[model samples]
Target: MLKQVEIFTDGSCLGNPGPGGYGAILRYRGREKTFSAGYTRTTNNRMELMAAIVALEALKEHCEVILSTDSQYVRQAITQWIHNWKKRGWKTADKKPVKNVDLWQRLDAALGQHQIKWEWVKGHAGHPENERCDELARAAAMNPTLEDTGYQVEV
Candidate 1:
């Protein structure tokens, strides 16, 4: 069976490491589903990664996915940097430990289940899907506190 899915995602934080949230829209066949969640404290990058994670995880089986996002970090990491980072045992080119390893690992595993094409779009430029996702993320950030247990607080 051939299954195809489309997703649009976005994430934001109030102040970088302050309240954060992620939003995603998944479209399969002729139907659509949306998801969003918030964290009491987290970074924008984390939320961006989380949005992709959640969207991919929602799939029931292997499929071809077209993932659209306004986050270059997430797109580039998945498409390019991940292979080298994994080859280096999760270290960066400068020999520093990779940030967001947990999310990256999860996204990697999910990627293995499907073929994905990543598309990056300019945020806040009136793209309908991107703007809606941004709105969803900002609203989630304002309420319903969620905990990001994976986040480490540097001393």
Candidate 2:
């Protein structure tokens, strides 16, 4: 088997539910690739999930991955909650539909393509990759906007 790649991702929003962006950094074989994009209207969680979605999409082949994120919501969902959510047909234990279902479904599909180990890191800390991802996300959010169909009507 090939060595796993390390992917760090982050998200930023001007407001809790406003213009936002997602950033991701993939490192493998001593090389790094970065990605970022802005959304016209979205939430921090959405951007966070989007970052992971984009990062996984970047891989050209099925490989092991170590995906690091600062968002507990994202990490927990992938590692823990998602199984229950799926078992319930995407409904929560309380029978409520999961928020960001679209992204969750997409993430699940991406996950099926690779062996992933999810990691959580403290945000705004001294972690170099996380810090760089934060910078990229913030910069993208500040630049401009793009329509986010999933964000339509804010559910």
Candidate 3:
């Protein structure tokens, strides 16, 4: 069996539901890979979840992975809340229809294929790779050249 790998992901929604971007970094086997992109319109939470899902989707099947994200929404939902929601037909704790089911479903599917643990980190507190991700996310958000963010099908 291979050792567990750590992936750090972050998202930036410029103007808060305006131009947005997501970032991710994967570290394993003494190597690293980084990804980021921007969209014309979106929310921070969406980008946060998207970044994680994108990172996870890149992994090999059944790989042990640790996803590090600054978004509590990502960590809590994946670790604790999602199980109940899934069992309840994607209803929320308050019985409300969960939002962003599309991304959540993809995230869930990716998780189903791996042994994953989610960790929360403080954003912008100087974790090297994570910091780089933020830079990429923000740059993409502010710069139009970085538009068309996201890998619909990662190869």
Candidate 4:
């Protein structure tokens, strides 16, 4: 289905496993809105997934959406790789633990609510909206508030 909405999103970390943030800009018709939040301790990928998840969660109704992001991890996970991850009940091919199951679940739930075409964009290329989202994400990360209890400290 053709998308009825457009969204651009980004995530940043003051330090991986430290303060993290996600920013998203949603556009419908001529109107637009920006969403963002920070986590006290998290991974870059977690925040990336949050950017996509929150953007979709903000929608009031089921609608086709095209969400753009700079993360290959985010794009491939949703597009070509999620099914493989899910079928094993969220285990990896190497039989090791998969990280960010919680955020992945949230993103998965968001996906069920909307038909989104995940678009990949090269970050820091000066794409206007993408740059704005990057700014928003970084700003939130600088003043991070909420605890990211889901974050598992890396080994």
In lDDT terms, which candidate is top?
1
Residue 91's C-alpha lDDT in candidate 4?
A: 79
lDDT of 4: 0.82
lDDT-wise, the better of 2 and 3 is: 2
lDDT of each: 0.84, 0.83, 0.75, 0.82
lDDT winner between candidates 2 and 4: 2
- Across 1-155, the per-residue lDDT of candidate 4 in tens digits comes to 22379889888887868899988998975678889899888878888888888888888888888877889888777678788888898877777657787888888888888777767878756369999898889998988888887787742
**lDDT of candidate 2 at residue 72, scale 0 to 100:** 77
- Ranking under TM-score, best-scoring first? 1, 2, 4, 3
lDDT of residue 154 for candidate 1: 44
TM-score of each: 0.89, 0.89, 0.82, 0.88
Q: Tell me how far the alpha carbon of residue 67 in candidate 1 is from the true structure, in angstroms, after superposition.
A: 0.6
Candidate 3 residue 127 Cα shift, in angstroms, is 2.3
Model 3: lDDT of residue 30: 66
Write the residue-wise lDDT of candidate 3 on 1-155 in tens digits.
Answer: 23788888888886645788888988766677787888876777778887888888777657788776778778777668888878899876677667777778878888889777766778756478788788788987885434434323221
Tens digits of per-residue lDDT, candidate 2, 1-114, equal 237788999998898668889889988666788899998788888888889888898888888899888897786776679888887899866777678888899988998899
What candidate 1 gets wrong by more than 4 Å, as runs, is 1-3, 93-96, 124-126
